[PDB]
């Protein structure tokens with residue numbers, strides 16, 4: 001078949017991992033999705049003239065994924081800009097990914113979600129500082145308005161291509 005990308009969306013509970021994925025796939029915004037559900041989804045996309053099938057694992061909790069973490073090609077590190085703890089927790093998710101791959105050079109994109117919400121507690125400069133330290137892009141998103149959602153997933157695809165021939 002066509003080119004495939006194995007994508008993994010990780011981050012603390014409630015940051016909008018499902019919302020972002022549902023947005024990419026169903027083109028709408030869900031207000032409540034079972035935070036316990038962990039599942040895979042497919043999306044055919046055309047990115048830079050390439051017809052791609054995205055294979056996306058939406059993680060839930062931490063206590064299928066084992067294989068997806070070992071074989072995942074790129075990762076969205078998602079926090080919510082109104083959840084300081086979720087931002088602080090990014091470190092743990094990145095370290096997890098590093099340890100599995102035994103590599104510092106894993107395709108990743110830092111995602112700051114819920115941009116539609118007033119009075120953020122995590123400023124863009126904090127987010128940019130962290131992404132800069134990791135050597136990865138930072139993209140601000142809203143799963144509610146869909147701003148940045150395509151940017152995040154397309155950018156991760158391009159990061160994967162930069163890392164390996166597809």
Ligand SMILES: Nc1nc2c(ncn2[C@@H]2O[C@H](COP(=O)(O)OP(=O)(O)O)[C@@H](O)[C@H]2O)c(=O)[nH]1
Nearest residue numbers: 013014015016017018019030031114142143144
């Ligand atoms: N206002 C707003 N709410 C969001 C956004 N993304 C997710 N949510 C909401 O935050 C809550 C958690 O979303 P969810 O997708 O379940 O987070 P998950 O546990 O990481 O999958 C839901 O009520 C969503 O409706 C967003 O971009 N803006």
Ligand SMILES: *CCC(=O)N1CC[C@@H](O)[C@H]1C(=O)Nc1ccc2cc(Br)ccc2c1
Nearest residue numbers: 012013014015016035080082083084085086
């Ligand atoms: C697992 C997701 C979760 O519990 N989260 C995400 C970040 C935090 O906001 C936390 C909450 O949802 N916390 C929370 C606190 C007070 C609430 C009051 C009411 Br009336 C309804 C929901 C609340 C959620």
Ligand SMILES: [Mg+2]
Nearest residue numbers: 017018035060
């Ligand atoms: Mg979820």
